[PDB]
Design a protein around this ligand. Structure first.
Ligand SMILES: [K+]
Ligand SMILES: [Mg+2]
Ligand SMILES: [Mg+2]
Ligand SMILES: [Mg+2]
Ligand SMILES: [Mg+2]
Ligand SMILES: [Mg+2]
Ligand SMILES: [Mg+2]
Ligand SMILES: [Mg+2]
Ligand SMILES: [Mg+2]
Ligand SMILES: [Mg+2]
Ligand SMILES: [Mg+2]
Ligand SMILES: [Mg+2]
Ligand SMILES: [Mg+2]
Ligand SMILES: [Mg+2]
Ligand SMILES: [Mg+2]
Ligand SMILES: [Mg+2]
Ligand SMILES: [Mg+2]
Ligand SMILES: [Mg+2]
Lengths: 169, 58, 296, 159, 215
RNA sequence: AAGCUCGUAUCAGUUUUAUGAGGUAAAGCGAAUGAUUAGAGGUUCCGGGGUCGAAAUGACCUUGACCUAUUCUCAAACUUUAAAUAUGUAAGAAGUCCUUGUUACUUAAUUGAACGUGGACAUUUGAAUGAAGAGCUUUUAGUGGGCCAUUUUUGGUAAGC
RNA sequence: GAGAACAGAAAUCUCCAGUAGAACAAAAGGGUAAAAGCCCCCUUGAUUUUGAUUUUCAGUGUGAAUACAAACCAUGAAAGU
RNA sequence: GGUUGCGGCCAUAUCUACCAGAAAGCACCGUUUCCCGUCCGAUCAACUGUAGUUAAGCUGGUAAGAGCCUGACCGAGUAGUGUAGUGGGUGACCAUACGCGAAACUCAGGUGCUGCAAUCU
RNA sequence: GCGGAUUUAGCUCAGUUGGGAGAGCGCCAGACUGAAGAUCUGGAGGUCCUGUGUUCGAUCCACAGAAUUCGCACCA
RNA sequence: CGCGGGGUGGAGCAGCCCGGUAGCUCGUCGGGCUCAUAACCCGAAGGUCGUCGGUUCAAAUCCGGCCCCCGCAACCA
RNA sequence: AUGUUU
């Protein structure tokens, strides 16, 4: 008895933060471009802190936002790398969740030493219908408490769908 | 040798000996800072009003 | 609540609330100041805004002026009035916006006695041209477009309503670089594409493309079109007839108002919770206190 | 060294009336000012253009000119032992219509009405205001109001 | 060398606290303001005795520390370390300045006189008003004479006139003893620390039920 | 000093009424900023150590910090509030109301703006008090070291500083 | 604050709270939240003419600033600026 | 009386936690050929009003609710302060006389009002 | 008291552009030598003069204080 | 302001006075020789010519700017 | 060409 309080993937963001801006960054860009099917966006470093050779605005990371069935499919493909089991600590209090994989080549196209091997970061932002209320230009509102996504609801939805399970507290 | 630097002592008494004078209000004050577009048209309006009032003596 | 909800007393005490219509996210006061503020050397001249709002299923087209007591509507036109002029589907599309602009323009000019003079663009070809002043005669009724918070894009329905009100004979200052058909690569607009949009050519082209593609989608969308037997090629003459009917009689017949305001109020007053009195609040507090004969 | 800038010593004068910061409400711009209207000057610190000098904060003058976004105000500034005419060009956010003469206009209208009704009904005018007069005699009753006797209280510390 | 207190007895200057514009202020001599059984509950110490200023003046931090030590030592040695709670209720926030005029005659040669005479931070002082409490001490009614004598001893360390006033309030609360007793018998007083919290007839009933089970 | 134009008359180191402006005195700190005393609840993700824990923080012990509700005391260069005194303006005939002429300005528009024509209103012509009158001009002297008293107040221990 | 491989206190990605506790060249004060802040697009009104005005003030100058007029422009859909 | 569009004053309107909402409106909601804009039709653009829902937004109600607002012989004629004395006091300061007169506090009440146009069981 | 200055592994110092603390002379270890000195190779070496503060960080961008010095301290 | 001159590996440097093409010595790294160092021998590393712009089948060199240094001379707001 | 000491 819940008309449209139906948890659904709002988006899935794939992220690869290379510590450098060299050819490795372009390689990671093409990696997370090929599976996403979209042009990704490089993320400039904001400081020059230490241990990374990063500097202000060096374009050290690359990420891509996927929605719809493509996001659902990339999620279901990245979940088998985790064997459809995730840590409870992976679930944010706002009802989102994520996981990290390594050796992206274990899906789709093989090693292809021209592109090399990369690890990737999967973050799934979960919402219900009516999330447009918070994002639209006009009459911007705040989703009500009963309608907010929670970790206690996202964990339950994540074991309902994908027939998965979670780990210790 | 140092000296006094400033004081307003006796200044109000000096000013009130001949008194603070209100600035003699006039009818028809000057149009100095008035908008020049308004003034340009006001000249024509006044010339026309003068001509009309002259002709109105028949 | 949490350590981040239920903000503290000092925060609540020092919070300055925005204007109510800024809290509601409805009025850009930065734009409203520049739309509404009049040259002080005119001393009474109302600045009229052609306010164009797009809700779901309805278009709001008003001509509004401002006063200290509040905005005053001069003439209003809605997209739910296009059925009277022979438009019953797509009541929020580009062509409906153009029709509503034409309707507000004709209605306002009639209200001001400027319908005969300033006929506007009666033979519309989709060309960029403003309502020109006639020689030895009153100037056209000037209104300034008010999008509100809707974005300025090339091809927006708000600029379709702008174009409709301009063609209707209202002087609405505007450029053409936001109309559909404007060639962003160059300095010119495609008048044939603008005319197509004015007459719903994009909607009818979609109708025929969807007919020659998956027919389930053409049965779901345009279901009312098939159930009213409206061919895609009939949209142009539908909009032509609508423009002619609008120019014929933009006189704003209002609805017949069944169940008059007294019974409207009486019916709505049943599903309305009333505020409790201070004695009722005291009784409720006393009841919650005395319910602890011991402690629950 | 010393410092006398244009906005020197205006730190509190040009502040925004705590919890009334931000955008100027539209009535300020919807006000209408004609040549001869009496206005009070109160600078809005959020509108830095057309701003009066700090001397004119709280001064009342007469509009002599009307421009696109501003009015010319005539102030009588005291300099030395006389008054000099000053012409300020103030944006309408820094001026409000003065109520220093609304009571006078209402008295003018009431006086015209009273004069008319008087020369219609009989012979009496009494059109000049009067200062608060000494109270008239009165009888004060004790029914339910028998006087209570108070005495000065002894000293105590209550600390 | 420290200048005698008579040079800074009176509130001749505006308050001059340590701030963004001083940055060079020496440490106050009195650093402890709560001593004795500062953890005792409000019920434990009903009697309050105040050492109250009768003059508008400035008390130095050195005088405050000396008087605190004197009073605490007397009350501790006569009645016990835990028989009282003494609180110093003035804080030396006003900075005193000194224009250091050179000794070692010939100073006039290497001296500009009163030129640039603005002084450097020299010490701290509390600015007390007439009727302002300087010391408060709560204790049991049986310890009245010991507490009053400790405050009378501390009085000798202060310039100006101070009065010993027995407070009609319960301990360090703002309620007169009959009213505190009435509220405690009514159950609208709960121990929080050495102080208490009072049940109000405002706020959420849920909170006023959780706290104060007087119902 | 010389006067000059007038004198039904003008104004005022004052009050009253009406209407503003101010951020000092006071006040406030369980209100923002900054200071500042103490105890009490939590946070073991408290900084964690010790101690066990085979080990984890897992238990404690504990100091630390944060968070919550309180508590003592403060600010020339803090502040929600906020005086007293002082201060701007108005209290009419150069006013108010009614009609309608000019314009190249302004309006969609005789719309408005400004200036007018014509018409109506003198006992209190629209508070109080006073007014060896009011207004105006020219031209020149000396002076341009100041000091003192109450009150406000800065530097200074202070000073007949 | 809560989350994501390397990745920890600091890298990048995500959500939530967030009256400004940030930023606006510099001193300080004021001002600013669909902005005056950040990012992006287009530009040269940092132009021409000669007046008026405010502060300092002798109601001189200089500096700075305000509101117009008469042009030519920029920008925006536009009001406007 | 509800609702929308535009509003005026800009918390009595805000904040937190719950509950309710008939009609209509608003809204979420469906689609990606076209105009347009995105890493992403999420936003923005367009199309449909059709497939669905009042879950959320929104509106209203509830709370010895936080905040805010109003008022008060509540505190308090207190603090402060204009004027006065060959008043007091070594002084610090203080009292008195003729006037003006707070803030905190306490308590009580309240929790948007309203303009134009349209629309609705 | 005024005007300058410089404070960094034990000693002398380089510093540091909003990084990251380094080079010699010492010291230790290991080589070579019958062995010592000499010489070679390495390695550790500081909580950057102090506290607090701007800061993503920042001895280094920056605030005041100290330590060691220099110079001046006159007309009577 | 004028007239001249100069800036090249870490350093001094020749190279330029009409492109055929960046070198000399020391210092630094390795080996040889020696019983071991020095000299010496054989190697190896170190610049693209202070910075811009221009002419030229292809410019350290020509041509003009900018910066820095030096020498002489010049001086009405 | 230089190569100290026991
Ligand atoms: K004493
Ligand atoms: Mg002297
Ligand atoms: Mg002099
Ligand atoms: Mg806008
Ligand atoms: Mg103010
Ligand atoms: Mg002083
Ligand atoms: Mg001497
Ligand atoms: Mg001040
Ligand atoms: Mg004070
Ligand atoms: Mg002289
Ligand atoms: Mg903007
Ligand atoms: Mg200057
Ligand atoms: Mg969508
Ligand atoms: Mg849209
Ligand atoms: Mg619901
Ligand atoms: Mg409440
Ligand atoms: Mg006297
Ligand atoms: Mg021997």
């Amino acid at each position: 008895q819940n008309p449209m309080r139906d948890l659904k993937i709002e988006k899935l963001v794939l992220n690869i933060s290379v510590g450098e801006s060299g050819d490795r960054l372009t390689r990671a860009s093409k990696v997370l471009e090929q599976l996403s099917g979209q042009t990704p966006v490089q993320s400039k470093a904001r400081y020059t802190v230490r241990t990374f050779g990063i500097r202000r605005n060096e374009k050290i990371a690359v990420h891509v936002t996927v929605r719809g069935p493509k996001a659902e499919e990339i999620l279901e493909r990245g979940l088998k790398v985790k064997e459809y089991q995730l840590r409870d600590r992976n679930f944010s209090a706002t009802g989102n969740f994520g996981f990290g994989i390594d050796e992206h080549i274990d899906l789709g196209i093989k090693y292809d030493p021209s592109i090399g091997i990369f690890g990737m970061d999967f973050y799934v932002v979960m919402n219900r219908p009516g999330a447009r209320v918070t994002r639209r230009k006009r009459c911007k509102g705040t989703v009500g408490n009963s309608h907010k996504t929670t970790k206690e609801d996202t964990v339950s939805w994540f074991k309902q769908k994908y027939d998965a399970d979670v780990l210790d507290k | 040798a140092k000296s006094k630097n400033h004081t307003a002592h006796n200044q109000t008494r000096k000013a009130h000996r001949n008194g603070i004078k209100k600035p003699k209000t006039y009818k028809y004050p000057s149009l100095k800072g008035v908008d020049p577009k308004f003034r340009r048209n006001h000249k024509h309006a006044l010339h026309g009003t003068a001509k009309a009032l002259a002709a109105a003596k028949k | 609540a949490f350590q981040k909800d239920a903000k503290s007393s000092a925060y609540s005490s020092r919070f300055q609330t925005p204007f109510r219509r800024r809290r509601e996210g409805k009025t850009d006061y930065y734009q409203r100041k520049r739309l509404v503020t009049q040259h002080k050397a005119k001393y009474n001249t109302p600045k009229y805004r052609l306010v164009v709002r797009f809700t779901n299923k309805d278009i709001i087209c008003q001509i509004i002026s401002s006063t200290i007591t509040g905005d005053v509507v001069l003439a209003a036109a809605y997209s739910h009035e296009l059925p009277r002029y022979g438009i019953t589907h797509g009541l929020t599309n580009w062509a409906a916006a153009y029709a509503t602009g034409l309707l507000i323009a004709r209605r306002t000019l009639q209200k001001l006695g400027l319908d005969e003079t300033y006929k506007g663009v009666e033979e519309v070809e989709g060309e960029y041209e403003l309502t020109e002043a006639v020689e030895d005669g009153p100037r056209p009724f000037k209104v300034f477009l008010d999008i509100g918070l809707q974005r300025t894009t090339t091809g927006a329905r708000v600029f379709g309503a702008l174009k409709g009100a301009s063609d209707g004979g209202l002087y609405v200052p505007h450029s053409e670089n936001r109309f559909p058909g404007w060639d962003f690569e160059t300095e010119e607009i495609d008048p044939e594409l603008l005319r197509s949009y004015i007459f719903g050519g994009h909607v009818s082209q979609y109708m025929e493309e969807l007919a020659d593609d998956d027919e389930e989608r053409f049965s779901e969308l345009f279901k009312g079109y098939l159930a009213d037997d409206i061919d895609a090629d009939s949209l142009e003459d539908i909009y032509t007839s609508a423009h002619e009917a609008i120019r014929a009689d933009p006189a704003f017949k209002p609805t017949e108002k069944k169940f008059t305001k007294e019974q409207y109020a009486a019916e709505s007053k049943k599903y309305r919770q009333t505020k409790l009195s201070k004695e009722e609040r005291a009784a409720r507090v006393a009841a919650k206190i005395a319910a602890l004969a011991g402690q629950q | 060294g010393k410092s006398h800038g244009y906005r020197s010593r205006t730190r509190y004068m040009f502040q925004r009336d705590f919890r009334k910061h931000g955008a100027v409400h539209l009535s300020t711009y919807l006000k209408v000012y004609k040549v001869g209207d009496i206005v009070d000057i109160k600078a809005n610190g959020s509108i830095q253009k057309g701003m009066p000098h700090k001397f004119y904060q709280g001064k009342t003058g007469v509009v002599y000119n009307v421009t696109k976004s501003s009015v010319g105000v005539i102030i009588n500034k005291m300099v030395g032992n006389r008054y000099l005419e000053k012409r300020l060009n103030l944006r309408v956010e820094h001026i409000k219509h003065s109520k220093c003469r609304q009571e006078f206009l209402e008295r003018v209208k009431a006086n015209a009405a009273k004069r008319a009704e008087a020369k219609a009904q009989g012979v009496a005018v009494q059109l000049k205001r009067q200062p608060a007069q000494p109270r008239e005699s009165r009888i004060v009753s004790t029914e339910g109001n028998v006087p209570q006797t108070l005495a000065p209280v002894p000293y105590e510390t209550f600390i | 060398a420290r200048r005698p207190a008579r040079c800074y007895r009176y509130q001749k200057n505006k308050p001059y606290p340590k701030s963004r514009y001083n940055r060079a202020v020496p440490d106050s001599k009195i650093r402890i303001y709560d001593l004795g059984k500062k953890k005792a509950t409000v019920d434990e110490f009903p009697l309050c005795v105040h050492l109250v200023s009768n003059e508008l003046e400035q008390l130095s931090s050195e005088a405050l520390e000396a008087a605190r030590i004197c009073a605490n030592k007397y009350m501790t040695t006569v009645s016990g370390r835990d028989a009282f709670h003494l609180r110093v209720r003035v804080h030396p926030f006003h900075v005193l300045r000194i224009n250091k005029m050179l000794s070692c005659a010939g100073a006039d040669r290497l001296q500009q006189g009163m030129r640039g005479a603005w002084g450097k931070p020299h010490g701290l002082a509390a600015r007390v008003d007439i009727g302002q409490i300087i010391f408060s001490v709560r204790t049991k009614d049986s310890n009245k004479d010991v507490v009053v004598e400790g405050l009378r001893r501390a009085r000798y360390k202060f310039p100006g006139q101070q009065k010993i006033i027995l407070s009609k309030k319960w301990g360090f609360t703002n309620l007169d003893r009959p009213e505190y007793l009435k509220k405690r018998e009514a159950g609208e007083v709960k121990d929080d620390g050495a102080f208490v919290k009072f049940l109000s007839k405002k706020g959420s009933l849920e909170n006023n039920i959780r706290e104060f089970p007087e119902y």
